[PDB]
Amino acid sequence: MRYGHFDDEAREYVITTPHTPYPWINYLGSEQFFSLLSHQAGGYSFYRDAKMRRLTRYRYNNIPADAGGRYLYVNDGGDVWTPSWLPVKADLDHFEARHGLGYSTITGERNGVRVETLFFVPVGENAEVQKVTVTNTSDSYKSLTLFSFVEFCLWNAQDDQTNYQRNLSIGEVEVEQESPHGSAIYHRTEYRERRDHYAVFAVNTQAEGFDTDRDTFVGAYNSLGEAAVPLKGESANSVASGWYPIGSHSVAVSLAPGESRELVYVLGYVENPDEEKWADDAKQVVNKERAHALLSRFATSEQTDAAFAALKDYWTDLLSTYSVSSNDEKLDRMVNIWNQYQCMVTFNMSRSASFFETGIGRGMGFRDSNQDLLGFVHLIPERARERIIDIASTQFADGSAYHQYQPLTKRGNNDIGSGFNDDPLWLIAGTAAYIKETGDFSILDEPVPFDNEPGSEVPLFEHLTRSFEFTVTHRGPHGLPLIGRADWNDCLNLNCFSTTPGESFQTTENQAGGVAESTFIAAQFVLYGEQYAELAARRGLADVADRARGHVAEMRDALLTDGWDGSWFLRAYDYYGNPIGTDAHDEGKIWIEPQGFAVMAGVGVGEGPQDTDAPAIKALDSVNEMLATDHGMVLQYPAYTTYQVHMGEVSTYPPGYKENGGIFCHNNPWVIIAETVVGRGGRAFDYYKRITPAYREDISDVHRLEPYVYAQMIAGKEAVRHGEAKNSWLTGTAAWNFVTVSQYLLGVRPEYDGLVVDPQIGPDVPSFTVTRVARGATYEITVTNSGTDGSRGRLVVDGTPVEGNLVPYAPAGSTVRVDVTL
Amino acid sequence: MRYGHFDDEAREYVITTPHTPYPWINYLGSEQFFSLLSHQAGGYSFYRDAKMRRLTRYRYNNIPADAGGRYLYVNDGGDVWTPSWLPVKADLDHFEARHGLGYSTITGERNGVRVETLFFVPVGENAEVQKVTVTNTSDSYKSLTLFSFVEFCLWNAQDDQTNYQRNLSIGEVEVEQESPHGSAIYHRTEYRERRDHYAVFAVNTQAEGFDTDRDTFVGAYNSLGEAAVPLKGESANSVASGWYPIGSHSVAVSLAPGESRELVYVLGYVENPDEEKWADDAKQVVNKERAHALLSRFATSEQTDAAFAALKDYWTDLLSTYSVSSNDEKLDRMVNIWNQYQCMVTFNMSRSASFFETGIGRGMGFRDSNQDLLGFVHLIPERARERIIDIASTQFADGSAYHQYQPLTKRGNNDIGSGFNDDPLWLIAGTAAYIKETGDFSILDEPVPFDNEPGSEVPLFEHLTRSFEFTVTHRGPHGLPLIGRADWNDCLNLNCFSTTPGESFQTTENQAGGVAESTFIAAQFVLYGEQYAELAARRGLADVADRARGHVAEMRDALLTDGWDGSWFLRAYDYYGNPIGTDAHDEGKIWIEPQGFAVMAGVGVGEGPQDTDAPAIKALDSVNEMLATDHGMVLQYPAYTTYQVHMGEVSTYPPGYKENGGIFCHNNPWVIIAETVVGRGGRAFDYYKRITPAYREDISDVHRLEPYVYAQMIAGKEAVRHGEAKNSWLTGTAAWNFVTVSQYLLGVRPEYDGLVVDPQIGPDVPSFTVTRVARGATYEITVTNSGTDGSRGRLVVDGTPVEGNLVPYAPAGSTVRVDVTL
């Protein structure tokens, strides 16, 4: 069953009931100020740092979930309800919520009163705006009082939730009932001291009254669903002194039958320079000039409507580089709108805040900065270039990388450190992807320091060299790369040996030395090793490139011998040189990561899909037999049923969840791409559909989470909850799936000298057109597709057949038409 | 107004309504297993470490507060209610909660069904036991279903509330409906990996059904007050797989009019040796032997009643060392019962978990370990001895101390470090108080290392020498002790200079060097400097003692000159040598800490209370005029109205709160003791009553927090919330007030050679008798008290008049009668 539907014309997901299987969220904000917003108005906002500059408070694992947010209590004759349904849960005659790109609307109607709220963060502003339309849909006169409500956070969310011994005495506000354009509340905790910022919550009309103390508005012993003040029907005009500050205004609204009223509410973040903090000589009254200026820009519905229009323009213009038109509307909506939106949100939000990530931790993986780029580089290439330079600037001189990058300070995380040996090669991955997209080889000459040390600058290219050489110089007894703390699988910790609750599996190493090797890093080195060698050669370093290709060849051989178990690739050798991922064991016989990545790297690929003795086909067939389920491919099989002390976190999960038998949507694409490489498009597209939001929409009761974005993890076949997802939105799954569908299924992918056109998607998509803007030109690519395994496209360019699958890049401004037959 | 009353015969506080101004809690547990229990059954339990072994989950800053606890939903013919009132909030015919020593009862009645629950942690057990009595008080038959409920925590409370990305997939249980004594649920998250422990929740009868998945029991979109299963009338028999594990059993109860039913529920913590973890060869089933044994010890009401009796005998015998009988019921209940209970709780709980401390942080102040000991050493002298040795073993060889002690690991906190220059002298304070109580000079000979380094051991006496010498060698330009990061006032940070939100005021030092000095440390050196000298001299080191008395003399001279502002003692000199705590300033003119501590040290004391020229009297008279309020004495005045960057955290608080003008109940005792020293007993007792729970019970609506224990902080006169307290239970206020009333107001205090009997309490307690057991003998001290300023006791010992105020210690076994006239 479904709980809504896509509206492709509006580019919205339309949730038609409050009673979803999980809170379904959207993200607002495209610059520095962001909001999380559920279909029940739940969530919170922050400026840049969700740990240290959170404006509003939100409780994770609340009972019930998501029961705090931006609420508007309607009092109609004594009856109090909320359009968001929650928190009051009064019966509504109509409910609808629409999540769009950077905005959402929530509409609730009860007893002849409809309330529509449009929520959005305007471009150019550090604020969340609410455009509220109240309509009297009855045949009687209505006289309403609306009470707004947001609960403030005391900026540092970690302190807010732990240090009550200090913080229940510091909450401060100022109230401005006669604001120039309405009424305003200012939350100013710690402005007294080291803070140069405050929040404003305001409405564009004169409020009847206000409240700033939560205990007074809500009342003792009450939940938000039973808040005393709206029930009494008049604000208490409470002025907070410590405890819990909030923003609430009451607004009187009288409407004849059929009449409506519009109101605009603003939650703003304001900073003043230090010499302008105070209005008064005695330094007691906050300088409100900047806040009044913001409120003046949203004083009318008209200004607000223009602002909303500019946001839609922003997203429309941004998503104008890749689109597809086919027989399959589920495919098209994913490629055209939702997947690309999700990749932008991962750029904007990193791994900070979702309804599973709590916004306290602030970094993301070095590996994920690079992988995310694969998905967003076609949209924001300038920012991509910068991100590459910023993360490369943190790299150590020996080539090792900080495992964790902090995007806000542009530094590596010192506490976590290094030692995850897959990390360095991902920088080659990111850089090459950037250069293929843009043609900007000049990035390789940029001066980039090591560990952010002034004076240490060398060309970015030399950082790639150091990443490459790190792996060469850190190989084990079989010539495979030493794994270190972990590789892409954060839970494969072969140098941990922990028996103490509390020790980090990723950073604890209770034995030193060993010979643990990873076949994942091996495959990664063949793939990105060849990418590095190509860049070196184009750079004119023939010798360096040939030597690199030498090492790459050696690693290919290592994978196909010591790395090969017979019918699939091994996963690793452990600390003592014993194999992991072999049929000789009862559990963990086959692991997905090496099979996908090695075949993407071309390792063991034969003469075609029917060359079934080819190690790549055997491995992929084994994946199909042992790992594939109706909800995607599980990470390994069988899952471990007892703790494997020599392997770290992996076996700590119950069978079927996360890294112990879970379906990692992030790594399924590696196998999808690998199936395109060997020529089995139908199987590739099947696997893509199994895990992709638009195709799972019809089983939303099973997926549980949002039906419009990828999640990290779907429960595997060994779990009672098989098919249920966790960890929506913030995941590398988005990038890898966009790469998969756009570049490998649909087949349109940038190379250094042209655009490759090599569709491999099987019979279910018999004709389609891709429109791709690349290097300033527009390529219109029409494909007629039989879907036959092993059939590859023959190209006709501007009406003339050509050999091969490469279209040399046209001059900017050109339109190039490519007809493909397969 | 009041919300209850003391029941002195029962040693309970009786809360007669659920509608208190704040959740009022008690602590269960006398050893390693502890519970917080509010008057609405809210709270949680943990074994030893509230951060890493929390059994059950509790939300701080919930809406409403304290919704979450151990609940019993009663379904009577489809009407559901809870006897704790929350969370359902059904109208009750009767409610009452009684908090006792290590136990509480909560009783609720509705529509002819009364439910009484006794909660306690039995001596010898790592468990919380509930004895529930259900009574049919109607004239009609009742058929009930009772649903128990607790929400488990996933052990590490920090991870539980942050790492959802992992931990929503790891929740595991086992269900045992046919347990040997009834029915049990086992919470066993991470038992599959590194944990050797699990929790059990069980009832001593066959349950009709069970639930272990919160979402199933409570239902989507519901709060605990609206839980679906109890409203449905039968358990759903849910078995958790991830998400939120709970323990719930349904028990069917049929009662004729006047009939009652008793049930016993147990929440137990069980650990198995690693070789004994599993019942089965396949290592999938937890070994339940130790759990069955526990449950076997609470299978009947009779066993439970006997355990309850042994707990009362524990507390009754523990509190048998100091008691008073007088005309003043309030004084007696504080001295005899509540103040001493609170001191024991501080020992047991350190500063871990209250309704203000969230149990995540695990250490306490080195200075507080010593100060708490002053209050509890008369009850648990052997544990005090061990504590002194354990904290002394962390001390650095230069005499400096770790600011924070971790009692669970018996180590100093390395992240915080040292540099709080008052810390070292508190060790002398603790040790001397210990020796005076017990006469155990042998402790000075115990081998004690520095910084827990093997081989470094020296006698404990040598540690006191390093503490003493640390101050001598760290004095500023005026001969006063350099303050360092802070002194007792953690918010007086004169070497901080922070303008950046997030920097710790206590540890950040943005300028080095300087000459900042503390007059508080100065007074502390005079007091405990003289105690060290006495110990050195009794130890036979005449030279050391005389030299120590010399430094003490010089410090006294420094305080009365450079440390004297004219009518009171300065507070400090800042980094640049400018005074703090002077009448020359508009703000922060007078600070309480030095006024009290210096006069405790005898500094400035004249020939009597009418010697108005004596600095000690001038200081105290200034305290009375400028700091004393009806709710206690504020820390300084006036409070700072703008941020003083040169002073750290102090001026970040709004005026009237915490260290910026708040009333610290911890430091009021210093002035109270000082007033007895100078001879103004009535003033002393006045001040004690202003801040003491029994005397504030009648303004519970103002104080807000528990009326049977001290809190840290009452809002000062410059706060709009003047009178309202924060930070109940865990505070050194308990210890210092116990010392004050037991040793200085009532006047009975141990010295090395005898018991001093020197009452100074004023006219309001004209006669009283103290029973003190000391060094194995019983002193019965009868006092007839005119209360006149400056009149001190004349003693008659066993019928014979003696000179002076010291009674030589009788041999163990003796009863000595002392009659005192003043």
TrEMBL record, chains A, B:
One of its GO terms (molecular function) is cellobiose phosphorylase activity. Pfam families: GH94_b-supersand, Glyco_hydro_94. SMART domains: CBM_X. Coiled coil: none annotated. Keywords: Glycosyltransferase, Transferase. It comes from the Bacteria. Residues 11-288 form the Glycosyl hydrolase 94 supersandwich domain. Its EC number is 2.4.1.20. Residues 314-747 form the Glycosyl hydrolase 94 catalytic domain. The keyword Transferase applies. GO terms for biological process: carbohydrate metabolic process. InterPro entries: 6-hairpin_glycosidase_sf (IPR008928), 6hp_glycosidase-like_sf (IPR012341), Gal_mutarotase_sf_dom (IPR011013), GH65_N (IPR037018), GH94_catalytic (IPR033432), GH94_Enzymes (IPR052047), GH94N_CBP (IPR037825), Glyco_hydrolase_94_b-supersand (IPR010383). This is Cellobiose phosphorylase. It comes from Cellulomonas uda.
